[PDB]
Ligand binder design. Structure first.
Ligand SMILES: *CC(=O)Nc1ccc(Cl)c(S(=O)(=O)N(C)CCOC)c1
Ligand SMILES: *CC(=O)Nc1ccc(Cl)c(S(=O)(=O)N(C)CCOC)c1
Lengths: 238, 238
């Protein structure tokens, strides 16, 4: 019940309490998962408001002019949007495990890997446009070309994760699209990328990843409603 | 002569000397201008190699797998690519005026403005596809819609520049597309954005901006060669 989304007609929410940060999220949004993985990895006390992205509250555009999740709002009333900006803000503003390195070059390397990854989220988009076994063969080739680039980074570094032998920001920033691969029937696309495939196994063992992972049944329930343009897609399961 | 570009058949260059950083650039590339504005604003000793982007040296893909400028290479042999990553790396790695704020929220704000700007560079692309007075009217409307978003930020802050009353990273990151507006005959697109129009006048007075500004005759010379796919476009004037 508590996780039910707010949509059109919902009262603007009150001030974020001191000692807490608020995320405007949607339970199946991969971009907002980035921000929730960081909040959990850093142990930041927070509250979640889920937004019905099919049936947005008008007041939500006061939080983010683009009308997109994720959005952070703190007790001072500051608003931060764009998933990679929300994650970096949280790593700098809060104590705990640093997810980005302090060294400028190593930090730039994490960003360059994110850049290597930057076509993957629009391919997941495009997966919607796949109607038949022919489009599905092309889609799989497109994922393979992108995954080879990430495979090369792990072969150069010979580390468990993209930022070294410990999980760091860059892993959490790319993870949500890998999480969705099995439910999209694109698991085979890591078959030519053995290190990327072991990276996925190591990610699923991470306490933070494991605490936020959605079951394939849960993601399928969402997608089917999403693809009808159902106002209930966002509240699948509730 | 010294600024002449290296292209196909050119010897791989030697190691970057200690005390210097190298940029792989192209004299009329707006993305690489971002990095050169930062190098100049921060007083960083550097050397420039200009790349013939129409006739790339094969060795240039060893600097950047994407084959794009800008690229930084330091004396340790580290490579940094993507214009916004090269600029942030330089602000963190070198002394002088900080171009990004230390406060995490104010830094996130600069990034959110960059996000507001993110459609402008592909419209400049698209300006190439404009053939006639009708396409030019549509193009102008598209620039206006984007410029209104930046106009709102200056009206909210009531500062000279996008990051406060002093010029900072965010100004240098968006400047190169405004510099090119007069030569593209898109000067009129700031006519409904009076604060953005005054921001352009303040930018042209900045010592760093003014030191790197290319004349309209120089940019026209480049564009005409560029649009023929001339291998000499990059060396216009030399
Ligand atoms: C927050 C969010 O879900 N944004 C977003 C925007 C575009 C696309 Cl394509 C996606 S998706 O790849 O997960 N897919 C279409 C399912 C929809 O997720 C809302 C997500
Ligand atoms: C470095 C660089 O010039 N990159 C680049 C990539 C695409 C586009 Cl469209 C441009 S441009 O908007 O300046 N224009 C097409 C002129 C070409 O500049 C090389 C630049």
């Amino acid at each position: 019940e508590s996780a039910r989304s707010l949509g059109k007609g919902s009262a603007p929410p009150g001030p974020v309490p001191e000692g807490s940060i608020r995320i405007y999220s949607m339970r199946f949004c991969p971009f907002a998962e980035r921000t929730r993985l960081v909040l959990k990895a850093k142990g930041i006390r927070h509250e979640v408001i889920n937004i019905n992205l099919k049936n947005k509250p008008e007041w939500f555009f006061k939080k983010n002019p683009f009308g997109l999740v994720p959005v952070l709002e703190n007790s001072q009333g500051q608003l931060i949007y764009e998933s990679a900006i929300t994650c970096e803000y949280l790593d700098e503003a809060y104590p705990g495990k640093k997810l980005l390195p302090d060294d400028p070059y190593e930090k730039a390397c994490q960003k360059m890997i994110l850049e290597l990854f930057s076509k993957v989220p629009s391919l997941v988009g495009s997966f919607i446009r796949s109607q038949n076994k022919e489009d599905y063969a092309g889609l799989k080739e497109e994922f393979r070309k992108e995954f080879t680039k990430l495979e090369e980074v792990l072969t150069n570094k010979k580390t468990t994760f993209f930022g070294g032998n410990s999980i760091s920001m860059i892993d959490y920033l790319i993870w949500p699209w890998f999480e969705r691969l099995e439910a999209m029937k694109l698991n085979e696309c890591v078959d030519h990328t053995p290190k990327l495939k072991l990276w996925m196994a190591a990610m699923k063992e991470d306490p933070t990843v494991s605490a936020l992972l959605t079951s394939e049944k849960d993601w399928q329930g969402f997608l089917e409603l999403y693809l009808q343009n159902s106002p209930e897609a966002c509240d699948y399961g509730l």
